[PDB]
Coordinates of C-alpha atoms and ligand atoms in Angstrom, one line a residue:
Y1399 CA 116.0 87.0 98.8
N1400 CA 112.0 87.2 99.4
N1401 CA 111.6 84.3 101.8
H1402 CA 108.1 83.2 101.5
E1403 CA 108.1 81.3 104.4
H1404 CA 108.8 84.3 106.6
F1405 CA 106.1 86.7 105.1
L1406 CA 103.6 83.9 105.8
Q1407 CA 105.0 83.9 109.6
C1408 CA 104.8 87.5 109.3
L1409 CA 101.1 87.2 107.9
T1410 CA 99.8 84.6 110.6
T1411 CA 101.6 86.5 114.0
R1412 CA 100.2 89.7 112.6
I1413 CA 96.5 88.7 111.7
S1414 CA 95.1 86.6 114.4
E1415 CA 93.4 83.4 113.1
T1416 CA 88.0 82.7 113.6
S1417 CA 86.9 83.5 110.2
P1418 CA 89.4 82.7 108.0
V1419 CA 91.5 85.0 106.9
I1420 CA 94.4 84.3 104.8
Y1421 CA 94.3 81.5 102.1
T1422 CA 97.4 79.6 101.3
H1423 CA 97.8 77.2 98.0
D1424 CA 96.7 74.0 100.0
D1425 CA 93.9 75.6 101.4
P1426 CA 90.9 74.1 98.8
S1427 CA 89.2 77.0 99.3
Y1428 CA 91.9 79.3 98.2
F1429 CA 90.7 78.7 94.6
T1430 CA 87.3 79.0 94.9
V1431 CA 88.0 82.6 96.7
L1432 CA 90.5 83.0 93.5
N1433 CA 88.1 82.4 91.0
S1434 CA 85.0 83.8 92.5
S1435 CA 85.9 87.2 91.4
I1436 CA 87.7 87.0 88.3
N1437 CA 85.3 88.4 86.2
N1438 CA 87.6 88.2 82.6
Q1439 CA 88.1 84.2 82.3
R1440 CA 91.1 84.8 80.2
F1441 CA 93.0 85.4 83.6
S1442 CA 91.5 82.1 85.7
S1443 CA 93.5 79.7 83.7
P1444 CA 95.7 77.9 85.9
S1445 CA 98.5 79.2 84.0
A1446 CA 97.6 82.7 84.9
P1447 CA 99.6 84.3 87.6
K1448 CA 98.7 83.5 90.8
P1449 CA 98.9 85.0 94.2
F1450 CA 101.1 83.6 96.9
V1451 CA 98.2 83.9 99.5
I1452 CA 94.8 85.9 99.0
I1453 CA 93.9 87.7 102.1
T1454 CA 90.2 88.5 102.9
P1455 CA 90.1 91.0 105.4
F1456 CA 87.2 91.7 107.8
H1457 CA 88.9 94.6 109.6
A1458 CA 91.1 97.4 108.7
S1459 CA 94.0 95.8 111.0
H1460 CA 94.2 92.7 108.6
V1461 CA 94.6 95.5 105.4
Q1462 CA 97.4 97.3 107.7
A1463 CA 98.7 93.7 108.5
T1464 CA 99.2 92.7 105.1
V1465 CA 100.9 95.8 103.9
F1466 CA 103.2 95.9 107.0
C1467 CA 104.6 92.3 105.6
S1468 CA 104.2 92.6 102.1
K1469 CA 106.3 95.9 102.3
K1470 CA 109.0 94.3 104.6
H1471 CA 109.1 90.7 102.9
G1472 CA 109.1 92.4 99.3
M1473 CA 105.6 90.9 98.1
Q1474 CA 103.2 93.0 96.1
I1475 CA 99.5 93.7 96.9
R1476 CA 97.1 93.4 94.5
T1477 CA 93.3 95.1 95.8
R1478 CA 90.5 93.2 94.6
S1479 CA 86.7 94.6 95.4
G1480 CA 84.7 93.4 92.6
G1481 CA 87.4 91.5 90.5
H1482 CA 85.8 93.0 87.0
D1483 CA 89.1 94.8 85.9
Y1484 CA 89.5 94.5 82.3
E1485 CA 93.0 92.9 82.2
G1486 CA 92.6 91.2 85.9
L1487 CA 95.0 93.7 87.4
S1488 CA 93.1 93.2 90.9
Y1489 CA 94.4 89.4 90.7
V1490 CA 97.4 89.0 88.6
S1491 CA 101.0 90.0 88.7
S1492 CA 104.0 89.0 87.1
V1493 CA 106.0 89.2 90.5
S1494 CA 105.0 87.4 93.8
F1495 CA 102.0 89.0 95.3
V1496 CA 99.2 88.5 97.5
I1497 CA 95.6 89.7 96.5
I1498 CA 93.9 91.7 99.5
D1499 CA 90.2 90.6 98.4
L1500 CA 87.7 93.4 100.1
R1501 CA 84.3 90.9 99.9
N1502 CA 84.1 91.0 103.2
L1503 CA 84.2 94.5 103.6
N1504 CA 80.6 95.3 102.2
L1505 CA 79.1 97.2 105.0
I1506 CA 76.5 100.0 103.7
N1507 CA 75.2 102.3 105.9
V1508 CA 72.6 104.2 104.2
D1509 CA 71.2 107.6 105.9
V1510 CA 68.4 109.0 104.1
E1511 CA 68.2 112.3 106.1
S1512 CA 71.9 113.5 105.5
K1513 CA 71.0 111.6 102.0
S1514 CA 74.4 110.0 102.3
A1515 CA 76.0 106.3 102.8
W1516 CA 79.2 105.2 104.0
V1517 CA 80.0 102.2 102.1
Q1518 CA 83.1 99.6 102.5
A1519 CA 85.1 99.5 99.1
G1520 CA 84.5 95.6 98.9
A1521 CA 80.6 96.3 98.4
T1522 CA 79.2 95.8 94.7
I1523 CA 77.1 98.0 92.9
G1524 CA 74.0 96.0 93.1
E1525 CA 74.4 95.7 97.0
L1526 CA 74.8 99.8 97.2
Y1527 CA 71.4 100.0 94.9
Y1528 CA 69.9 97.3 97.2
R1529 CA 70.8 99.3 100.5
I1530 CA 69.4 102.6 98.7
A1531 CA 66.3 101.3 98.2
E1532 CA 65.7 99.7 101.1
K1533 CA 65.6 102.8 102.6
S1534 CA 64.1 105.3 99.9
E1535 CA 62.8 105.0 96.8
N1536 CA 63.9 108.6 95.6
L1537 CA 67.5 108.3 96.6
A1538 CA 69.9 107.1 94.6
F1539 CA 73.7 107.0 93.4
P1540 CA 75.4 107.6 90.1
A1541 CA 77.3 104.8 89.3
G1542 CA 77.0 101.6 86.9
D1543 CA 74.5 99.4 85.9
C1544 CA 76.5 96.1 86.4
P1545 CA 75.5 95.2 89.8
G1546 CA 78.4 92.6 90.7
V1547 CA 81.1 95.3 90.2
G1548 CA 82.7 96.3 93.4
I1549 CA 82.5 100.0 94.3
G1550 CA 86.2 100.2 95.1
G1551 CA 87.4 100.0 91.6
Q1552 CA 84.4 101.5 89.8
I1553 CA 84.6 104.7 91.7
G1554 CA 88.4 104.3 91.6
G1555 CA 88.3 104.9 87.9
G1556 CA 85.1 107.3 87.9
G1557 CA 82.0 105.2 87.4
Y1558 CA 79.9 106.2 84.6
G1559 CA 76.0 105.4 84.5
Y1560 CA 72.5 106.2 83.6
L1561 CA 72.6 109.1 86.1
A1562 CA 75.8 110.9 84.8
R1563 CA 74.4 113.2 82.6
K1564 CA 72.3 114.4 85.4
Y1565 CA 74.8 113.9 88.3
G1566 CA 78.1 113.3 87.0
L1567 CA 80.2 110.2 87.9
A1568 CA 80.4 108.0 91.0
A1569 CA 83.6 109.9 91.6
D1570 CA 82.0 113.3 91.3
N1571 CA 79.8 112.3 93.9
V1572 CA 82.2 110.9 97.1
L1573 CA 82.0 112.9 100.3
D1574 CA 84.6 111.2 102.3
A1575 CA 86.8 107.9 102.0
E1576 CA 88.9 105.8 104.2
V1577 CA 92.2 104.4 102.8
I1578 CA 95.3 102.6 103.9
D1579 CA 98.2 104.2 103.0
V1580 CA 102.0 102.9 102.3
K1581 CA 102.7 103.4 106.0
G1582 CA 99.8 101.7 107.3
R1583 CA 97.8 104.4 108.5
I1584 CA 93.9 104.7 108.3
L1585 CA 93.3 108.2 106.5
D1586 CA 90.1 109.7 106.0
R1587 CA 89.5 112.9 103.5
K1588 CA 90.5 115.3 106.3
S1589 CA 93.8 113.6 106.9
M1590 CA 94.9 112.0 103.5
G1591 CA 94.3 115.5 102.1
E1592 CA 92.4 116.9 99.4
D1593 CA 95.1 115.4 96.7
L1594 CA 95.0 111.9 97.4
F1595 CA 91.5 112.3 98.0
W1596 CA 91.3 113.6 94.7
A1597 CA 93.6 110.9 93.0
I1598 CA 91.8 107.6 94.2
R1599 CA 88.5 109.1 92.9
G1600 CA 89.3 108.2 89.3
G1601 CA 92.8 108.7 89.4
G1602 CA 93.1 104.6 90.3
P1603 CA 93.4 104.2 93.6
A1604 CA 95.8 100.7 93.3
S1605 CA 98.5 103.2 92.8
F1606 CA 98.1 105.2 96.1
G1607 CA 96.9 102.6 99.0
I1608 CA 93.8 100.5 99.7
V1609 CA 90.3 102.4 99.9
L1610 CA 88.5 100.9 102.6
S1611 CA 85.4 102.7 102.1
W1612 CA 83.5 105.7 100.5
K1613 CA 81.3 108.1 101.6
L1614 CA 78.6 108.6 99.1
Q1615 CA 76.4 111.3 98.3
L1616 CA 73.2 110.3 97.5
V1617 CA 71.1 112.1 94.9
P1618 CA 67.3 112.5 94.5
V1619 CA 65.3 110.2 91.9
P1620 CA 61.7 110.3 91.3
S1621 CA 59.1 107.4 92.1
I1622 CA 58.6 106.5 88.7
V1623 CA 61.3 106.6 86.0
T1624 CA 60.9 104.8 82.6
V1625 CA 63.5 102.8 80.8
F1626 CA 63.3 101.1 77.5
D1627 CA 65.6 98.3 75.7
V1628 CA 64.8 98.3 71.8
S1629 CA 66.2 96.4 69.1
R1630 CA 66.4 97.8 65.8
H1631 CA 68.0 96.7 62.2
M1632 CA 70.8 98.5 60.9
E1633 CA 70.2 98.0 57.2
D1634 CA 66.8 100.2 58.1
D1635 CA 67.6 103.9 56.8
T1636 CA 65.3 105.5 59.8
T1637 CA 67.4 103.4 62.1
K1638 CA 70.4 104.7 60.1
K1639 CA 69.6 108.1 60.4
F1640 CA 68.5 107.3 64.3
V1641 CA 72.1 106.7 65.1
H1642 CA 73.3 109.9 63.0
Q1643 CA 70.9 112.0 65.6
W1644 CA 71.9 110.0 68.2
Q1645 CA 75.8 111.2 67.7
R1646 CA 75.0 114.8 67.7
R1647 CA 71.9 115.3 70.0
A1648 CA 72.1 112.0 72.8
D1649 CA 74.7 114.2 75.0
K1650 CA 72.6 117.4 74.2
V1651 CA 68.9 116.2 75.2
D1652 CA 67.3 116.7 78.5
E1653 CA 69.8 115.2 81.0
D1654 CA 67.2 113.0 82.8
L1655 CA 67.6 110.9 79.2
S1656 CA 70.6 108.4 78.8
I1657 CA 70.1 106.0 75.7
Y1658 CA 73.2 103.6 75.1
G1659 CA 73.6 101.9 71.7
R1660 CA 74.7 98.6 71.1
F1661 CA 75.7 96.9 67.7
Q1662 CA 76.2 93.3 67.0
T1663 CA 75.9 91.2 64.1
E1664 CA 73.3 88.0 63.9
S1665 CA 73.1 85.3 61.7
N1666 CA 71.6 80.2 53.1
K1667 CA 73.2 82.0 56.4
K1668 CA 72.7 85.9 56.2
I1669 CA 74.8 88.3 58.3
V1670 CA 73.0 91.5 59.8
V1671 CA 73.7 94.2 62.2
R1672 CA 71.2 94.4 65.1
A1673 CA 71.0 97.9 66.7
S1674 CA 69.8 98.0 70.3
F1675 CA 68.8 101.1 72.4
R1676 CA 68.4 101.1 76.0
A1677 CA 67.6 103.6 78.5
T1678 CA 66.8 105.1 81.6
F1679 CA 64.6 108.2 81.5
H1680 CA 64.1 109.7 85.0
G1681 CA 60.5 110.6 84.5
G1682 CA 57.3 109.5 83.4
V1683 CA 56.7 107.6 80.0
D1684 CA 54.7 110.1 78.8
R1685 CA 57.4 113.1 78.9
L1686 CA 59.9 110.4 77.7
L1687 CA 57.9 110.0 74.7
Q1688 CA 57.2 113.6 73.8
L1689 CA 61.1 114.0 74.1
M1690 CA 61.7 111.6 71.8
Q1691 CA 59.0 112.2 69.0
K1692 CA 60.8 115.8 69.5
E1693 CA 64.5 114.7 69.6
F1694 CA 64.3 110.9 68.0
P1695 CA 61.2 110.3 65.9
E1696 CA 63.7 108.1 63.8
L1697 CA 63.8 105.5 66.7
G1698 CA 60.0 105.1 66.4
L1699 CA 59.8 104.3 70.1
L1700 CA 56.5 102.9 71.1
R1701 CA 54.6 103.4 74.0
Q1702 CA 54.8 99.8 74.5
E1703 CA 58.4 99.3 74.4
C1704 CA 58.6 101.6 77.4
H1705 CA 58.2 100.4 81.0
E1706 CA 57.7 102.5 83.9
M1707 CA 59.3 101.4 87.9
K1708 CA 61.3 102.2 90.6
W1709 CA 64.7 103.8 90.0
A1710 CA 66.5 100.8 92.0
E1711 CA 64.2 98.4 89.6
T1712 CA 65.9 99.8 86.5
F1713 CA 69.1 97.6 87.5
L1714 CA 66.4 94.4 87.2
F1715 CA 65.4 95.7 83.8
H1716 CA 69.0 96.5 82.4
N1717 CA 70.4 93.5 83.7
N1718 CA 67.8 91.0 81.7
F1719 CA 65.9 90.3 85.2
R1720 CA 62.1 90.9 83.6
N1721 CA 59.9 88.1 84.9
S1722 CA 62.3 88.9 90.2
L1723 CA 63.4 90.7 93.2
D1724 CA 65.6 93.6 94.2
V1725 CA 67.4 90.6 96.5
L1726 CA 68.9 89.6 92.9
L1727 CA 71.3 92.7 93.1
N1728 CA 72.3 91.2 96.6
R1729 CA 73.9 88.3 94.5
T1730 CA 77.5 89.3 93.9
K1731 CA 81.0 84.6 83.0
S1732 CA 83.5 84.6 79.7
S1733 CA 86.6 85.8 78.4
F1734 CA 86.9 89.0 76.6
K1735 CA 89.2 91.9 75.2
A1736 CA 87.6 95.3 75.5
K1737 CA 89.0 98.9 73.9
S1738 CA 86.9 102.0 73.9
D1739 CA 87.4 106.0 72.9
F1740 CA 85.9 109.1 73.1
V1741 CA 84.5 110.9 70.5
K1742 CA 84.5 114.5 70.0
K1743 CA 83.1 114.9 66.8
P1744 CA 80.0 112.8 65.0
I1745 CA 81.7 110.0 62.9
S1746 CA 80.7 110.5 59.3
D1747 CA 78.0 108.1 58.1
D1748 CA 80.0 105.9 55.9
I1749 CA 82.8 105.7 58.3
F1750 CA 80.3 104.2 61.0
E1751 CA 79.0 101.6 58.7
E1752 CA 82.3 100.4 57.6
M1753 CA 83.1 100.7 61.3
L1754 CA 79.9 98.4 61.5
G1755 CA 81.2 96.0 58.9
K1756 CA 83.8 95.1 60.8
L1757 CA 81.5 93.2 63.3
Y1758 CA 80.7 90.8 60.3
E1759 CA 83.8 89.2 61.2
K1760 CA 82.7 88.4 64.6
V1761 CA 79.0 87.3 64.5
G1762 CA 77.5 87.1 68.0
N1763 CA 80.4 87.5 69.9
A1764 CA 81.6 91.1 69.2
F1765 CA 79.6 94.5 70.3
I1766 CA 80.4 98.2 69.9
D1767 CA 78.6 100.1 72.6
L1768 CA 77.8 103.8 72.4
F1769 CA 77.4 106.1 75.7
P1770 CA 76.3 109.6 75.9
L1771 CA 78.3 112.3 77.6
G1772 CA 77.1 115.8 78.1
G1773 CA 74.8 117.1 80.7
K1774 CA 76.2 117.4 84.0
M1775 CA 79.2 116.0 82.7
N1776 CA 79.8 119.4 80.7
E1777 CA 79.4 121.2 83.8
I1778 CA 82.0 119.6 85.5
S1779 CA 85.6 120.7 85.5
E1780 CA 88.2 118.3 83.8
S1781 CA 90.2 118.7 86.8
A1782 CA 87.5 118.1 89.3
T1783 CA 88.7 114.4 89.3
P1784 CA 91.3 112.6 87.6
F1785 CA 88.6 112.0 84.8
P1786 CA 89.2 114.7 82.1
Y1787 CA 87.0 113.6 79.8
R1788 CA 84.0 116.2 79.9
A1789 CA 82.9 119.3 77.8
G1790 CA 84.0 118.6 74.4
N1791 CA 83.4 114.6 74.7
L1792 CA 80.2 113.8 72.8
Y1793 CA 80.2 109.9 73.8
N1794 CA 82.4 107.0 74.6
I1795 CA 82.5 104.2 72.4
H1796 CA 83.4 100.8 73.9
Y1797 CA 84.3 97.7 71.6
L1798 CA 84.3 94.1 73.0
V1799 CA 84.8 90.8 71.5
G1800 CA 83.8 87.8 73.5
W1801 CA 84.8 84.3 73.7
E1802 CA 84.2 80.9 75.7
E1803 CA 87.5 80.6 77.9
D1804 CA 89.1 77.3 76.8
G1805 CA 92.8 77.6 77.2
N1806 CA 93.4 78.1 73.7
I1807 CA 95.9 81.3 73.2
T1808 CA 95.2 80.9 69.3
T1809 CA 91.6 81.6 69.7
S1810 CA 92.6 84.3 72.1
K1811 CA 94.8 85.9 70.0
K1812 CA 92.7 86.0 66.8
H1813 CA 90.1 87.6 68.7
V1814 CA 92.3 90.3 70.1
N1815 CA 93.8 90.7 66.6
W1816 CA 90.5 91.5 65.7
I1817 CA 89.4 94.0 68.1
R1818 CA 93.1 95.8 67.9
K1819 CA 92.6 96.2 64.0
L1820 CA 89.2 97.9 64.6
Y1821 CA 90.7 100.0 67.4
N1822 CA 93.5 100.8 64.8
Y1823 CA 90.7 101.6 62.0
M1824 CA 88.9 103.9 64.3
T1825 CA 91.9 106.3 65.2
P1826 CA 91.6 109.0 62.5
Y1827 CA 87.5 109.7 63.9
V1828 CA 88.2 109.6 68.0
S1829 CA 90.0 111.6 70.1
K1830 CA 93.6 111.9 69.9
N1831 CA 96.8 113.6 71.6
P1832 CA 95.6 112.1 74.0
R1833 CA 93.8 109.1 72.8
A1834 CA 91.2 109.5 75.7
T1835 CA 90.6 106.3 77.2
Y1836 CA 88.3 105.5 80.4
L1837 CA 90.5 104.1 82.9
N1838 CA 87.5 101.8 83.9
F1839 CA 87.6 100.2 80.4
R1840 CA 91.6 99.4 81.6
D1841 CA 93.4 98.7 78.6
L1842 CA 97.2 97.3 78.9
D1843 CA 97.1 97.8 75.0
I1844 CA 97.5 101.7 75.2
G1845 CA 100.9 101.2 77.0
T1846 CA 102.5 99.9 80.4
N1847 CA 104.8 100.9 82.5
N1848 CA 108.7 100.0 82.8
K1849 CA 109.1 96.4 84.1
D1850 CA 112.8 95.7 83.0
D1851 CA 114.3 99.0 84.1
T1852 CA 112.7 101.2 86.5
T1853 CA 115.7 102.8 87.9
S1854 CA 115.1 106.5 86.3
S1855 CA 111.9 107.8 87.5
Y1856 CA 112.0 110.8 84.8
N1857 CA 112.0 107.8 82.4
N1858 CA 109.3 106.0 84.3
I1859 CA 107.2 109.1 84.2
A1860 CA 107.7 109.6 80.6
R1861 CA 106.8 105.8 79.8
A1862 CA 103.9 106.1 82.0
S1863 CA 102.8 109.3 80.4
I1864 CA 101.7 107.0 77.5
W1865 CA 99.1 105.4 78.7
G1866 CA 98.7 107.8 81.7
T1867 CA 98.0 110.9 79.8
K1868 CA 95.0 108.8 77.6
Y1869 CA 93.4 107.8 81.2
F1870 CA 93.7 111.5 82.8
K1871 CA 94.8 114.1 80.0
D1872 CA 96.7 116.6 81.9
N1873 CA 95.8 115.4 85.3
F1874 CA 98.2 112.8 85.1
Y1875 CA 101.1 115.2 86.1
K1876 CA 98.9 116.3 89.4
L1877 CA 98.5 112.3 89.7
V1878 CA 102.4 111.7 89.6
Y1879 CA 102.7 114.9 92.4
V1880 CA 100.5 112.7 94.6
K1881 CA 101.9 109.6 93.8
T1882 CA 105.5 111.2 94.6
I1883 CA 104.2 112.4 98.5
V1884 CA 101.7 109.3 98.8
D1885 CA 104.0 106.5 97.7
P1886 CA 107.6 107.5 97.1
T1887 CA 109.0 104.2 97.2
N1888 CA 106.3 103.2 94.9
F1889 CA 105.2 100.2 97.1
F1890 CA 101.7 99.9 95.6
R1891 CA 102.9 99.5 92.0
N1892 CA 100.8 97.6 88.6
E1893 CA 101.5 97.7 84.9
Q1894 CA 99.3 100.9 84.9
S1895 CA 100.4 102.5 88.1
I1896 CA 101.5 106.0 88.6
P1897 CA 105.3 106.4 88.9
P1898 CA 106.6 108.5 91.6
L1899 CA 109.1 111.4 90.9
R1900 CA 112.4 110.4 92.7
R1901 CA 115.7 112.0 93.6
Ligands
FAD189 C1 82.9 93.5 84.2 C2 82.2 94.8 84.2 C3 82.4 96.3 84.3 C4 81.7 97.2 84.5 C5 80.4 97.4 84.0 N1 79.6 98.5 84.2 C6 79.9 99.5 84.2 C7 79.1 100.7 84.4 O1 78.2 100.5 84.0 N2 79.8 101.8 84.4 C8 81.3 101.8 84.3 O2 81.7 103.3 84.8 N3 81.9 100.6 84.4 C9 81.2 99.8 84.5 N4 82.4 98.4 84.6 C10 83.6 98.8 84.8 C11 84.1 98.9 86.4 O3 83.8 100.1 87.0 C12 85.8 98.8 86.2 O4 86.2 97.4 85.5 C13 86.2 98.6 87.6 O5 87.6 99.0 87.4 C14 86.2 97.3 88.2 O6 85.7 97.4 89.3 P1 86.0 96.3 90.3 O7 84.6 95.6 90.0 O8 86.3 96.7 91.9 O9 87.2 95.8 90.1 P2 88.7 95.0 90.5 O10 89.3 94.2 89.5 O11 88.5 94.8 92.0 O12 89.4 96.7 90.8 C15 89.5 97.4 89.6 C16 91.0 98.0 89.8 O13 90.7 98.9 90.9 C17 91.6 98.4 92.0 N5 91.1 98.6 93.4 C18 89.4 98.1 93.7 N6 89.3 98.2 94.6 C19 90.5 99.1 95.0 C20 90.1 99.3 96.6 N7 89.4 99.2 97.2 N8 91.3 100.2 97.2 C21 92.2 100.2 96.0 N9 92.4 99.9 94.7 C22 91.4 99.1 94.4 C23 92.2 97.0 91.5 O14 93.3 96.9 92.3 C24 92.2 97.1 90.1 O15 93.1 97.7 89.9 C25 79.6 96.0 84.0 C26 80.9 94.7 84.2 C27 79.8 93.6 83.7
LIG190 C1 77.7 102.1 81.5 C2 79.2 101.7 80.9 C3 79.9 100.6 81.0 C4 79.3 99.6 80.3 C5 79.6 98.1 80.4 C6 79.1 97.0 79.4 O1 77.8 97.2 78.8 C7 79.5 95.5 79.4 C8 80.7 95.4 80.1 C9 81.3 93.8 80.1 O2 80.1 93.1 79.8 O3 81.8 93.3 80.2 C10 82.5 92.2 80.3 C11 81.2 96.4 80.8 C12 81.0 97.7 80.8 O4 81.6 98.6 81.7 C13 80.4 102.7 81.1 C14 80.7 104.0 79.9 C15 81.7 104.6 80.5 C16 81.9 106.2 79.7 C17 80.4 106.8 79.2 C18 82.9 106.8 79.9

C-alpha cells in the first residue's frame, strides 16, 4: 500500500540535497538526531516506535516538501521542536511516520524598539531568553523556566512561568505566527485567519499544521528582580501553615510575585517530606521581604535567602547555575510519568497531608509541584486562547515520578501505577467536569482518540471530547470547528489530536 521507497524518492527529489536534511535508518546520525531531543527517556528505547526518516528542515520548502510527500504516500508527520512532550507525541506514533525536527529553525530576531521578536518555532526557551537579554535587560517574554523546551510546543500548549501572573501565558503574548497547513501553504496570522491563529496558541498545533515561527510580544521587566529557592521541613507546623496560606494567597498576592512549591520525600532510616519554595519576584528584595512579611511570615524567608539579579539571570538560578554565563542557556535526562490538576478551592490540611503521605512510597523520585495562578491570569478570558483555566482556578498541581531508564517495563508499570493511584486519590479535591488538565502536561491517561475505528466523525468528536474538554473545557468545540475547516481530511493527527467534523 504505502510504498516507503516511493515516499523516499518523493522526498529526495523535492528536497534538494548541502546540509543534510533527510536522515534514514542506515544514516548513523539518524539515531543521535532522534535521541538528542527525546526528553522522556521512556520513549528512547530501541523498542519504541521509530520514524521512517527524520527531516531537519532549514527552510520552509523542506517542510512543504515533507507535507506534500507524506500526504501523497500516506506517511504521518510528527513535528518536533524541543522534544519535551510528556508522552513523546513529537517523535513516536503507532503508524508509519516521519519526524519534522525543527532544531535548525531556531533563528530569533529581537527588536527592542517594537518590543517584539520573530522566533522560529525550533528555538528553545533558553535561546529566546538569551536573545532577549542580548538586546535589553528590561525586556522579557512570559514563558517557562526549562531552557531546553521548544518554543513551538510550549506556546502551542499555552506556556506558563514566573511572569504568567503578570502577563499571562506565552500564548497570550503572540502577535503573529507562520504555519504550514495541510495544503502546504505558508500562512501567517492574517492569511491563516483569527480562528487558526487562536487554535495554535494553546490548542496543540500538531492538530492543525506545522508552526514555523512565532511573533512574540516582549514585555518589560525591571533591571533588578529577586529570586529565592528555599527548603523547609513539612514536619514543622510553620511550614504546614505556610502551605495552608500558600493555597489561599499565592494566586492573590502582588502580580510581581510567583512562588512555586515542590514536595518530595528524603531518607535507622527515617523518611521526611521536604517542602521547597522557589520564586521570582519582579522587583527589589526590600519590597519582596515586606510583601513576604505581610503575606507569608510562615515561610520565615531570610534576606540572605534572596538573590537580586537581572531578569534573564533568574533562569540560571532556577536551573541550578549558581556558580556561569548566560551562554549556558544556548545549550539546547530520565524517564518519567507526570499527571496534573487544577485546584479551584483550597485542599483541607488533612487531605493535603494524606496526599503528601503518598510520597513516602517514592523517596527521591516523586515530586508534587504547586504553581500559583491568579493575577493577570484572572483578567484573561477563558476563550482568549484555547487554554481555558483562568479565573476561578487557584493553582496548578503537578505530580511526577521519575526513574532511570533501563528498559524494564515492570519498573515503569510500578511507577505509573503509583502516580495513577495518587491522581485517583486527588479526584474529589481538584477540578471536575471537566478534570482540568494543562495541555503542556500531556497525559494520554485522560483519554485518547479512536485508532481502531475512526469512520464516524460524530464518534471521533465524542471520544475526543473526553480528553478534549479536560485540556480546553468549552474551547474544545471551536477547536473542532477550526480542525474541520483547516484540516478536514485529518492529515495532522496524533493520539490526542482534534478530530474534524466530516460529512
Ligand atoms: C520537559 C520540560 C517541559 C516543560 C518544562 N517547563 C515548563 C514551564 O516552565 N512551563 C510550561 O508551561 N511548560 C513547561 N514544560 C512543558 C512544555 O511546555 C511542554 O512539554 C511542551 O509541549 C514541550 O514543547 P517542546 O519542547 O517543543 O516539545 P515537543 O515534543 O517538540 O512538542 C510538544 C507537542 O507540540 C507539537 N509541536 C511542537 N512544535 C510544533 C510546531 N512548530 N508546530 C506544530 N506542532 C508543534 C509536537 O508535535 C507535540 O505534539 C521543563 C521541562 C524540563
Ligand atoms: C512552570 C511549570 C512547569 C514546571 C515543570 C517542572 O517544574 C518540571 C518539569 C520536568 O522536569 O519534566 C521532566 C516540567 C515542567 O513543565 C508550568 C506550570 C503550568 C500551569 C501553572 C498551568
